[PDB]
Amino acid sequence: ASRLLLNNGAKMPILGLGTWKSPPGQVTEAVKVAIDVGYRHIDCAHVYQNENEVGVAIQEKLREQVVKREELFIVSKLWCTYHEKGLVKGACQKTLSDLKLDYLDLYLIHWPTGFKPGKEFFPLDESGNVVPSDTNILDTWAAMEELVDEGLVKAIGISNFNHLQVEMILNKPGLKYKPAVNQIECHPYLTQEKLIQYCQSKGIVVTAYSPLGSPDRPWAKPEDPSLLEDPRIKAIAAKHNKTTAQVLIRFPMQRNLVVIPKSVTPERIAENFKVFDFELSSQDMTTLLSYNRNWRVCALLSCTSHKDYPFHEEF
Ligand SMILES: NC(=O)c1ccc[n+]([C@@H]2O[C@H](COP(=O)([O-])OP(=O)(O)OC[C@H]3O[C@@H](n4cnc5c(N)ncnc54)[C@H](OP(=O)(O)O)[C@@H]3O)[C@@H](O)[C@H]2O)c1
């Protein structure tokens, strides 16, 4: 069942179901199965273009008495084109209506980079590059803070913020609500020891995304590394009579991180849940940490010149 305590007093399920790349015609069934299997945490976002269909499943399980709303922990994220002051509430209310809820448990700033407002998620000029907004992280944070004061979201947090951008928020004059969660990419090829040690020292819960290395990212190459087929990680799994995926999901949990693997496949959704009944030794953990290559799945390469691009700093 177990769960981590956030700085607003709420409890966040350490395992959750990710929904990026989950087709609209498959994800409702996926979330229904997840909730049946015992998932109490769904990770969503407006930019995934499937929140209506995630919301159909959540509504069905609520009507069915399988779960009450307080048992669920629903996360969504504010996209980059909605960073302006006047647009944050609207973006939150659209997500709430698609998911058919009246509050979110956690609302994240998806990326620290703001884009020009409009219908395109990645707006382009005549040269072909992303058009930035002149908004900054602190004004976007003040808008997120008033969503807490209005009752639309219980906790607010951030995603893909480096340590200096987190510092900015923590040092902000008149700061009312601390970031509850920083959601970052984390697996054995990108272990993130410095950013995790920093967030944890400030009471910020870390959520690991792409724990299996995201084998279905649309920009995948044949010569890219594969976590799931890594023989060294295969060997650790075999020693524990588990799968490589079960080892890769257990790895962040023992680092006190929240982990959110994605799947639309009912048998893998089930498999990914059976991770509470075994332990990796401290030797296993230290071995998996040694596999760090500093390799990112999600590098947002089109925004490399944006003033708030997060990955130029070391951590
Ligand atoms: N905040 C952000 O900026 C951000 C960025 C990236 C990701 N995320 C979140 O993190 C979630 C998880 O990361 P991700 O979607 O990149 O990828 P992931 O969870 O690392 O991997 C998903 C892929 O692995 C497969 N898989 C799942 N379980 C498996 C198993 N037991 N055995 C073999 N293969 C398995 C899935 O296939 P099937 O689905 O076909 O089973 C899918 O192809 C996303 O859905 C999203 O919610 C957030």
Side-chain angles (χ1 to χ4, degrees):
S2 291
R3 281 189 185 231
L4 294 178
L5 190 270
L6 303 177
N7 48 227
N8 70 152
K11 307 269 209 166
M12 176 175 190
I14 199 156
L15 182 63
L17 178 79
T19 57
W20 172 41
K21 291 179 273 57
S22 300
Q26 284 176 51
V27 67
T28 295
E29 212 50 43
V31 174
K32 280 166 70 171
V33 171
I35 290 174
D36 282 346
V37 167
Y39 288 75
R40 295 298 182 257
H41 175 187
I42 310 298
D43 185 67
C44 308
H46 174 60
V47 76
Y48 301 165
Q49 285 180 71
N50 56 192
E51 293 198 311
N52 185 56
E53 288 88 351
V54 171
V56 171
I58 296 174
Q59 270 307 119
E60 278 185 72
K61 302 331 258 183
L62 290 180
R63 176 202 183 100
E64 204 185 330
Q65 309 292 80
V66 185
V67 282
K68 48 211 221 282
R69 174 65 183 86
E70 316 92 74
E71 278 180 280
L72 294 176
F73 196 94
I74 307 304
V75 186
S76 188
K77 306 176 196 92
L78 176 84
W79 186 240
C80 307
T81 54
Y82 302 102
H83 277 207
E84 348 284 293
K85 284 289 206 88
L87 280 53
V88 175
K89 188 183 170 174
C92 183
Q93 284 177 149
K94 182 66 190 168
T95 279
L96 287 169
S97 73
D98 282 341
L99 292 168
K100 292 165 276 285
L101 306 173
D102 49 33
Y103 69 91
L104 293 169
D105 294 275
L106 183 62
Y107 199 42
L108 308 177
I109 305 180
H110 207 148
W111 289 86
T113 57
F115 305 164
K116 176 178 74 184
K119 309 174 74 51
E120 306 279 293
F121 293 158
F122 286 89
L124 301 183
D125 45 29
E126 77 141 86
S127 306
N129 41 288
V130 183
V131 182
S133 181
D134 66 17
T135 63
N136 59 244
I137 288 159
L138 296 186
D139 290 329
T140 314
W141 193 254
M144 296 280 283
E145 277 183 336
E146 78 176 85
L147 303 174
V148 183
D149 290 336
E150 286 182 52
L152 300 178
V153 308
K154 265 57 207 158
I156 45 175
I158 54 186
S159 188
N160 307 115
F161 277 51
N162 66 216
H163 98 277
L164 272 185
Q165 293 168 323
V166 188
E167 270 263 289
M168 280 204 95
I169 294 178
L170 295 174
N171 287 317
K172 168 183 167 54
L175 183 66
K176 201 170 175 176
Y177 300 110
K178 259 171 77 262
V181 170
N182 187 190
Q183 188 177 312
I184 54 163
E185 189 188 321
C186 195
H187 45 254
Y189 292 161
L190 181 78
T191 53
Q192 301 258 225
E193 313 197 47
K194 283 182 173 118
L195 187 55
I196 287 171
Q197 250 57 254
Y198 169 85
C199 285
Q200 287 184 163
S201 67
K202 306 289 193 184
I204 297 165
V205 170
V206 178
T207 298
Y209 75 67
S210 293
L212 319 168
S214 199
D216 63 326
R217 67 200 137 92
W219 55 87
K221 285 174 180 182
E223 68 269 14
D224 276 326
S226 186
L227 278 160
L228 289 171
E229 311 279 21
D230 189 316
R232 304 174 296 184
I233 307 177
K234 283 180 158 148
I236 295 168
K239 200 226 306 183
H240 288 274
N241 299 307
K242 292 284 176 167
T243 64
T244 301
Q246 280 167 339
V247 169
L248 293 174
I249 293 150
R250 184 72 191 176
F251 173 55
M253 287 178 168
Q254 281 179 227
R255 305 183 61 190
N256 301 315
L257 312 185
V258 174
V259 62
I260 53 179
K262 167 264 178 184
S263 190
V264 289
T265 314
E267 53 250 49
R268 289 171 176 181
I269 288 161
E271 181 185 308
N272 292 354
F273 189 78
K274 281 190 289 93
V275 290
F276 300 96
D277 51 10
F278 79 109
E279 266 187 286
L280 298 163
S281 64
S282 49
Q283 176 169 200
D284 284 335
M285 295 290 292
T286 297
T287 301
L288 288 160
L289 285 160
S290 79
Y291 295 156
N292 184 48
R293 283 181 219 191
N294 300 310
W295 176 77
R296 292 180 171 340
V297 166
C298 279
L300 208 71
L301 292 175
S302 72
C303 295
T304 202
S305 295
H306 192 291
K307 62 186 180 70
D308 295 302
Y309 180 78
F311 306 138
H312 287 140
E313 292 281 319
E314 213 214 325
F315 66 112

